[PDB]
Input
Amino acid sequence: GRMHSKGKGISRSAIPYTRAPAPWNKYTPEDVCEQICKLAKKGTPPSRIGLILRDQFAIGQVKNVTGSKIVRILKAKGLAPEIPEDLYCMIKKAVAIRKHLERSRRDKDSKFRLILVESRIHRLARYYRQARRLPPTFRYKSDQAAALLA
Amino acid sequence: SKTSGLYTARKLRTVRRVNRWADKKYRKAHLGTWLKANPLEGACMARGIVTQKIGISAKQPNSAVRKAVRVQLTKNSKKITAFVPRDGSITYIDNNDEVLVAGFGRAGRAVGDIPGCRFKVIKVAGIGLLALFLRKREK
Amino acid sequence: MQRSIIVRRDYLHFVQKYKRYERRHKHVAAHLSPCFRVKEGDIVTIGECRPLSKTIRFNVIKVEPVSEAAKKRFSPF
Amino acid sequence: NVDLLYPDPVEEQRKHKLKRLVQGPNSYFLEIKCAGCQDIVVVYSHANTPVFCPGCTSQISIPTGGKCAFTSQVERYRQ
Amino acid sequence: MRAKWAKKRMRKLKRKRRHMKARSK
Amino acid sequence: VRINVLRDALKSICNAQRIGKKQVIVRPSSKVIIEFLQLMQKNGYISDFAVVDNHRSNRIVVNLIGRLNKAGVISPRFDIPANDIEKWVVNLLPSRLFGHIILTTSQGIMDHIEAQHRQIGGKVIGYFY
RNA sequence: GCCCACAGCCCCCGCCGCGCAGCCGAGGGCAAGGUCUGUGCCAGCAGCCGCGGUAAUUCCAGCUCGGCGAGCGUCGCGCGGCGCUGCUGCAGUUGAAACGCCCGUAGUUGGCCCCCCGCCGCCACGAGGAAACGGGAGCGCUCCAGGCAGGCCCGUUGGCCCCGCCGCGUGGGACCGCGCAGCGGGCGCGGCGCGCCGCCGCCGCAGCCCCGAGGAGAGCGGGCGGGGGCACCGGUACCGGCCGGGGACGGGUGAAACAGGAUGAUCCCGCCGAGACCGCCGGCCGCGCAGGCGCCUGCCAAGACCGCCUCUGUCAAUCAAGGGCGAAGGCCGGGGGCUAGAAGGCGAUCAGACACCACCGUAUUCCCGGCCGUAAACGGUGCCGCCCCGCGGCCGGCGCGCGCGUCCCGCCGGCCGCCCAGGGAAACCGGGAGGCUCCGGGCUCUGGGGGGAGUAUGGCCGCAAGGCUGAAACUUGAAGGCAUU
Output
């Protein structure tokens, strides 16, 4: 179930059993990688670029066609985001919750949400540091979070 | 409950050590607060000089005047009230006679109708009280 | 410490009544030779030596480096 | 004669995709035709993100909870 | 509510007992 | 979370056999699970088993003949000296003569009698009677 | 005689030769009179249940009988009984007991995956080091507790096992965790042969990514909800005022009585002021981490769920300490002030009433900043995980199908009712309190007969009120649960 919520919901994408380029596929692996870089230049978060390739184009799974996941392709060209996107999205959510709370000190429920989002940021950050994706130097500073977004 | 894991022995050892104290039986046996409280002070018998004699009304429903001698133990100068067993055997006891008093039998609990009395007289003036009742020996 | 390290060595102690074990850790002082450079968490092969001080009876014989952050990780090697 | 390891596909698709014998994708790829062009734009059935017709610079898909609705003149031509 | 009224009497005695302790502190 | 996958498996196997259902389905496929099933097939307790692949955990469908009394796991896996497979049989098996206790040993996953022949012991994986 | 430092004891012989039982009980538990005396709730007995108050199966004695036996009874304690300490192996809805809630580190626990190597446990077998002891080979101390004996005898014997030795050796390496680096070749035996270490594209190497959890996190879209804050803001009612009206009561109640009426009340109608409060719709509706949550128009961040061929790749679980939240009442500074209303005052009642019912009324209720830290905070049921038998309702999201409609059928997440199995001491649970004496998924919390006592004292916390932690001495044979009559 959800770490900070009591919901037991299971909405999960299930990838196809046969990992193959679509029968209707007409594009090379490099062609997809060159397209991916253009969206990376646009700055689109990696989850979004996968959605765009699936909906705007028709590559259902990048691994099936290119042979690599989108983040691995970004890392190869050095077009990877410095913070793994998953941490960035929580950090951005925490920044907004902090801003709303600064206007209202009476929103006790909002403070509750801030503790959980910040706790998730700290938990995920430790994993990234251990993996070496992020530096041992990384520490979460609420004060520097907005600056960290850039 | 029952946390079980290959490396969880310490938690189980601590739980047993802390929880074992809860039973009145482990505490009375091992806390040892009772040893200090025990007039007998960890002995089966104690020698004390009779300082008083009295009749204690038996707890209702049973009714009688149980015959007892209040004795201060020689060992700790600690007061004890001791029942005299057998029929009319308080006649054998005399004030200042010196008696050996042994546990009534419930390990520090009052036994039977006698109220709040935990000790019984087994010897009077060097002669067994039962033997005095059975006429084996005289005075 | 000055040219010294407190090597922590982990180990398991088995209790028979509860067939479960208890992870037990001990701290031992060791002399660090300047020839070696160690950061906390590194594995050091201490070798027994003459009682060199009040607490130092072991001296580092070899060091293998470890990463900055890879978790404390109970290791009874 | 009920046999597991050999299930009936029309009945099996009712099962949650993950609770099926092999975790499968319910979603598929249609091949929608353009508003006037004979070109076929292949569209993922579940498209939360907007898609557009080739050449014709206008919306082709309405995002929904499930299967996307189609905004312009469309021929489903499902694949 | 005898349990409630019993804890009110205990609380009263505990107030008086602490106050008396303070006089002789 | 899901920790001992074997407990899940055996609980579903015993439950399905209790209602009689001929086929039972186990969500996660494991080497230890397959080996317990292979030991059950060797003693005939399970009629047949097959693993459907999902490119994930892998799923297992077990054909039950209807002859299984109970199958359980022991957690944590306790190391058993070859001397103690005497005592464990007494408290975990129905009778000294019949019933099987299965222990993982360096030689492999084997029944109590097989490891008694080899005079070796390992950690209990579980018990099938 | 034999034995002995010397006796003696044993044993061997002659000669005499003289067997000798207690202690606790007989109502049960507990084996053994429902005997015969005394006695009369006295005296006593009785571990416990109890017995005795005139027909004592229980005392005190004879009588018989029973147990055990040269011993038997009592007391204190250990162990066993007691699965009443529980690892095996306890219990926590109601018997004692799930922290009020969420976050949370230490701790503990972690899905699936690579065979074939290195460390760790791990199992086996060694070695090494004390015997006695305890086993255990053999041996008739006349038996036996014993002891190492013995007998023309394995070089007569006196074997052998047993220091978890938390080490060491060796093998297995299933299970169990962990292992970031390019490799191969050539100088190079780079100074008796390797290893270094450099340096050659040096051309040999598929050089180099398991997978995508009916784990978790991030995303996108689609709707959903009395979820939160902040302003704005309607509506009537209660209450107070005011103008006109019309004329004797009005309130109140179970009856009353007090306070209100010609200073015109009650009552009617307009009008204003003030503060609360969201009616009927409003619930087997929903949202929320609980506590809780319902006027209008906004405004601001959220949240679960569903849908998905989106991204990440174990990032997880449960949790000492630590942090936040927490109905009401209370408090402390500021407001505000209708109503209701602890205190307080009155008026009936009653023996009393000082309580219930009426009347008036302060703190409070309301707001803002703090404090408090508790509730029958309950669903009296911790959390994550799996299996789980059908039948109904309801809420949200989605899908399939057709006349087609807020239809039909599912799926997922909830909120519920009834139950078959199963379970339980039952009441009852059954989406668990099932899958559990055939007992072991993980992790925290608490309980261990009733009082004493949540007291004393010590600590901390609080402005206090108090909270949190927390006894013992001592007392007692019951307390409790659920059902039946």
